[PDB]
Amino acid sequence: MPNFFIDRPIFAWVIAIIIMLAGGLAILKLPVAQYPTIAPPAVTISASYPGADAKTVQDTVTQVIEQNMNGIDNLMYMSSNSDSTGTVQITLTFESGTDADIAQVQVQNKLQLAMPLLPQEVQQQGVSVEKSSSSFLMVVGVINTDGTMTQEDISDYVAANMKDAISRTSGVGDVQLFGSQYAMRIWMNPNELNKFQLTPVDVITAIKAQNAQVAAGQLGGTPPVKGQQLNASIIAQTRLTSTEEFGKILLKVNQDGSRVLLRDVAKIELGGENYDIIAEFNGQPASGLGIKLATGANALDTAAAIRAELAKMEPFFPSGLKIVYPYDTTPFVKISIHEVVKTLVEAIILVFLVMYLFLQNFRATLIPTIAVPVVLLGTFAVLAAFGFSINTLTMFGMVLAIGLLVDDAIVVVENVERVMAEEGLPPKEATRKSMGQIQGALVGIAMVLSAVFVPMAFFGGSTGAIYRQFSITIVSAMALSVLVALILTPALCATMLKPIAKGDHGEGKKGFFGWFNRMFEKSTHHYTDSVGGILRSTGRYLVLYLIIVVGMAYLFVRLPSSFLPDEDQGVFMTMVQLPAGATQERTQKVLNEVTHYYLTKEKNNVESVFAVNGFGFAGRGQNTGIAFVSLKDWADRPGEENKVEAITMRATRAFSQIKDAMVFAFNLPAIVELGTATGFDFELIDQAGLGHEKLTQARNQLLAEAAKHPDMLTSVRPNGLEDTPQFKIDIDQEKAQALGVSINDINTTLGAAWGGSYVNDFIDRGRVKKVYVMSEAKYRMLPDDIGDWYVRAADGQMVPFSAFSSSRWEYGSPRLERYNGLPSMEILGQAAPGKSTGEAMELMEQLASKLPTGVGYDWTGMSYQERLSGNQAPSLYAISLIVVFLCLAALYESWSIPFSVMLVVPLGVIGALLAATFRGLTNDVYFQVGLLTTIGLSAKNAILIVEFAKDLMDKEGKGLIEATLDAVRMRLRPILMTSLAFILGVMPLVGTGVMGGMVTATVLAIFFVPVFFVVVRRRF
Amino acid sequence: PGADAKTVQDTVTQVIEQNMNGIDNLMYMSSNSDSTGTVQITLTFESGTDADIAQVQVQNKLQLAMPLLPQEVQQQGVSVEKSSSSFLMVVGVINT
Ligand SMILES: CC(=O)O[C@H]1C[C@@]2(C)[C@@H](C[C@@H](O)[C@H]3[C@@]4(C)CC[C@@H](O)[C@@H](C)[C@@H]4CC[C@@]32C)/C1=C(\CCC=C(C)C)C(=O)O
Ligand SMILES: CC(=O)O[C@H]1C[C@@]2(C)[C@@H](C[C@@H](O)[C@H]3[C@@]4(C)CC[C@@H](O)[C@@H](C)[C@@H]4CC[C@@]32C)/C1=C(\CCC=C(C)C)C(=O)O
Ligand SMILES: CC(=O)O[C@H]1C[C@@]2(C)[C@@H](C[C@@H](O)[C@H]3[C@@]4(C)CC[C@@H](O)[C@@H](C)[C@@H]4CC[C@@]32C)/C1=C(\CCC=C(C)C)C(=O)O
Ligand SMILES: CCCCCCCCCCCCO[C@@H]1O[C@H](CO)[C@@H](O[C@H]2O[C@H](CO)[C@@H](O)[C@H](O)[C@H]2O)[C@H](O)[C@H]1O
Ligand SMILES: CCCCCCCCCCCCO[C@@H]1O[C@H](CO)[C@@H](O[C@H]2O[C@H](CO)[C@@H](O)[C@H](O)[C@H]2O)[C@H](O)[C@H]1O
Ligand SMILES: CCCCCCCCCCCCCCCCCC
Ligand SMILES: CCCCCCCCCC
DSSP states (O other): OHHHHHSOHHHHHHHHHHHHHHHHHHHHHOOBOSSOOOSOOEEEEEEEOTTOOHHHHIIIIIHHHHHTOOSOSSEEEEEEEEETTSEEEEEEEEOTTSOHHHHHHHHHHHHHHHGGGSOHHHHHHOEEEEETTOOOSEEEEEEESSSOOOHHHHHHHIIIIIIHHHHHSTTEEEEEESSOOEEEEEEEOHHHHHHTTOOHHHHHHHHHHHSOOOEEEEETOSSOOTTOOOOEEEEOOOOOOOHHHHHTOEEEEOTTSOEEEGGGSEEEEEEESOOSOEEEETTEEEEEEEEEEOTTOBHHHHHHHHHHHHHHOGGGOOTTEEEEEEEESHHHHHHHHHHHHHHHHHHHHHHHHHHHHHHOOSGGGTHHHHHHHHHHHHHHHHHHHTTOOBOHHHHHHHHHHHHHHHHHHHHHHHHHHHHHHHHOOOHHHHHHHHHHHHHHHHHHHHHHHHHHHSGGGGOOHHHHHHHHHHHHHHHHHHHHHHHHHTTHHHHHHHHHOOOOOTTOOSSSOOHHHHHHHHHHHHHHHHHHHHHHHHTTSHHHHHHHHHHHHHHHHHHHHHSOBOSSOOOOOSEEEEEEEOOTTOOHHHHHHHHHHHHHHHHHTTTTTEEEEEEEESOOSSOOSTTEEEEEEEEOOSTTSOSGGGSHHHHHHHHHHHHTTOTTOEEEEEEOOSSTTTOOOSSEEEEEEEOSSOOHHHHHHHHHHHHHHHHTOTTTEEEEEESSOOOEEEEEEEEOHHHHHHHTOOHHHHHHHHIIIIIOEEEEEEEETTEEEEEEEEEOGGGSSSGGGGGGOEEEOTTSOEEEGGGTEEEEEEEEOSEEEEETTEEEEEEEEEEOTTSOHHHHHHHHHHHHHTSOTTEEEEEOTHHHHHHHHHTTHHHHHHHHHHHHHHHHHHHHTOSSTHHHHHTTGGGTTHHHHHHHHHHTOOBSHHHHHHHHHHHHHHHHHHHHHHHHHHHIIIIIOOOHHHHHHHHHHHTHHHHHHHHHHHHHHHGGGOOTHHHHHHHHHHHHHHHHHHHHHHHHHHHO | OOOOHHHHIIIIIHHHHHTOOSOTTEEEEEEEEOTTSOEEEEEEEOTTOOHHHHHHHHHHHHTTTTTTSOHHHHHHOOOOOOOOOSOSOOOOOOOO
């Protein structure tokens, strides 16, 4: 085939132009984001029940919906929370590979049929269903600095004038408002209600009657009295639009014609739907939007358009209203794309320098400059053809792929110039010569390298999704580089290289290159002499080979092993937890001192503190909170002591002296869709209707046994909230019936005054908003306020709650978890230092076996995933080596010669093993794929050397040691050229020994490869 | 039920429209709100788009506004189906 395109250089140009046009169109059409979708599809059902405790939520909503989640396909597990905020969430997690559209429609369709089974208040509130496994592109914060707008005002403005514009923006997929818009709040007064013999039932009845829309009909509608001239709609009532009109709602006409209006027994003002969250941004009132990138979109274009539209809106923007961007993922996208172009142009500069230093002509330095960008552009086409996006994983894969594409380029040009200098052939006849020498090895290298990278793409779940990005990027760039090296570079050498006289090695030219040429020739003969000597004492170097492979196994096992470490992202969280019964004000004081710490003692690192009151990591409530701390870029806080790893520990130790609170700073994960991957996620399950307290006791027994094993388990804790005092109030049914009081009036008065009640909607400047009734705060704080509410009896007399109720304190759970339909408790932990998380998990299974009867367990989250990927590892690694061996045996026509190459490649890997040792790197997926790339690259060196060795023995009938020496002589310059390009490339990143490790990664190959070729063919 | 076109728009059409964002292959969106109290929101998709997946995605995005819609409407039923705009034929029936 290369013969074909050398006689047809313009056909090959046509093919390279097609590849460039496809790659350009691919870059224009290609989606771009930080990470691809790795998390398995998760659909979350959310509902609200105002005034409700955790078990009313569970006993009327959660269990009912969970019982109707049948018939849905491809479900892995379902978990759900019911807390004392009236909030329930049910997350159904599906198998990786299942259509998230079909998954969500099936879930909501079952929920729809279950809706008539829910309480009438829950149906009124409405039930939402979202895809929860997608994460935010950025978070636009909207804060007020002049101290004139409350958070309710900011969020109302953002919904009215910002949100829908942001959603209509191109690329935006979903926008979530971090707050509630205005709501017509009715703050009743029990003393005024009692003064007029009124209850909240009357207030609600009047509101439903006077703030209603009423559909009459038509004036002169069909069927008419024919003769009729006019047809017109009849409109009776419509909604209200003002607080003033709500104040004039007539509740009662006194019998002397006097009016009792709603304003006379309640305060009326625009407020929030919800008052349990308090969001601040550096101590200022705050709100914002969480924006999600749409499907097939460009995060760079979308973020620009978002800041563009936010940039515009100033002709409408109120006083003190500022936009801030506490969280944004597109900087990391831009960094990973920039490092691809930085590596590409630095690659062509260095290969230009090295090609010229060895070959002393400019026309040879053009063939790599053309060939490399062609295949880099083709990779984008192949990525687009298969549905992949430009992300940090594929861009990492392209950066690693560049090193192999330049070696493919250098090998082909160098061998044709060696054939011209050794044999004195014209460029055309000599290029036929040279690819006839290397074409089979080139194809075999393609098979070998996909045998390395392809099999790891077949992990399941999250692990496979990450490996797929590297695999297709590297295998694509490798396969097209081979196709280009058999099509494009043959024609370019045959068409562009000058002839060379036989024997002209440039020893006779002058200046610097004359000195270099015979310096290199002298070293070339030194090298062949030394390898010739090594081939007499091969037992000695076989022993040295094993001395160094146990040395590599040692420093490899010693490295920290973490699949996806939580690197410094520029944002971290700090969790806040106060005791049972703690009020919102007490939480705010703690958060106030938390931001005061961050903005003073970490002045030079912290840029923003986004404090959230009422919402915790492990569970919501008045005694929970979390602060999102965003830091300045990596430049303006140099040194490792100013990274998140040390800031969090300084923050945690400083926060240990906080009285009456439990504060903890920690790093958010690299892939927030997954959450850590550090440790395990554990589910304790009531399998036999045991009850809450029994399950709590078992969890305590499990936690105690875990703490007794610090050599294996670290920080084993529940991911939930502990039981708290609650106010139990009993209605005497007999006393109620004897006084003529209905139970519905009693419960409606209690739940409306104290819990609040959603009545109906109204229209505020053309936007539909809700109407809530509730008591004033001062009349619904403490138990003695219960006796200030009166209820009307059938005889008209007003009775107070004290006459027919009794109260006591008891304990109950503010948060009830469920797993797969049964009551559960989520436990978190990680393995002790040095130990694997697999051992920690099997210790937990042991300790769980002796829990009380009727208590099961299960693994959820990414512990489910690691169980999956761990059972796949050995077969995948086994198939990789099996097919590698098979293709090499196909290349060399030998069941034995593959062992020569397979046994030498773990030597190039240790040029990076010590670099991780001196810098302090971690063994992760990024380091592992990098190890494979080095293994493949060094595997290309030995494959060519052994190919030339065998060809010389088979074609020319040369001796074994003669052919081996001739082979390593013909291959020394290209190996040192490629390695020289690499060492000069990483030198600007510089600790001298890291470069000195790469050099012996090369010197080990050039000596040991001939050793293994001779040792293997002797023994077989 | 019977509401004027202004109420229907402010309490149903706008709510459904504000959540019809970011859907695959959506070209444009038209809607009318009638004196009868009825809404039709027609979402039009790029040619070649699978219509059944399109209907699926519309129902999934409609769920985000399903809670916010009024009392009467959420229970009375919200149809979401593929649609045509033209008549293929008119079959007529007379009595002779
Ligand atoms: C000057 C230079 O070094 O390269 C510049 C030039 C640059 C390579 C740009 C990255 C990206 O726009 C590039 C694209 C793919 C964008 C438009 C496409 O049609 C390509 C034909 C075009 C090639 C050049 C260009 C315009 C650069 C960047 C990166 C800035 C953008 C990101 C996402 C990191 C850079 O400044 O490094
Ligand atoms: C010209 C050339 O080929 O060097 C390129 C190629 C380069 C040496 C890269 C630095 C680094 O990734 C390199 C390592 C050592 C990283 C992982 C290792 O296991 C090696 C298998 C790998 C070899 C090639 C690679 C990918 C280069 C750089 C440095 C810029 C890269 C980053 C991430 C800032 C360059 O020159 O710009
Ligand atoms: C994790 C992984 O990738 O397996 C790697 C790791 C791998 C099993 C290697 C095949 C072979 O050398 C392996 C042996 C047993 C080779 C003999 C000894 O020296 C061992 C100390 C060495 C340990 C692992 C190693 C180095 C791999 C291959 C096949 C590589 C073959 C070619 C031609 C590149 C692979 O990439 O699949
Ligand atoms: C579904 C099947 C997938 C199998 C993949 C397995 C990988 C196989 C890699 C094989 C790569 C090419 O394999 C190789 O092709 C070249 C083509 O000149 C042959 O070449 C052989 O004959 C020609 C002339 O007749 C000589 O110039 C050449 O030096 C000699 O080795 C080799 O005999 C063969 O081993
Ligand atoms: C030329 C380029 C190279 C071509 C490379 C082709 C790669 C082909 C990859 C096939 C992927 C399937 O790999 C398949 O994984 C499953 C796990 O789910 C393995 O099954 C394994 O895991 C199960 C759990 O499921 C374990 O209980 C058990 O130890 C084992 O049987 C199968 O034995 C294996 O066949
Ligand atoms: C061989 C080089 C390959 C480079 C690939 C770059 C891919 C980027 C494609 C999207 C470009 C988006 C531009 C963002 C504009 C920001 C305006 C401030
Ligand atoms: C023997 C001639 C082969 C020609 C192949 C042309 C198509 C190459 C596409 C990559």
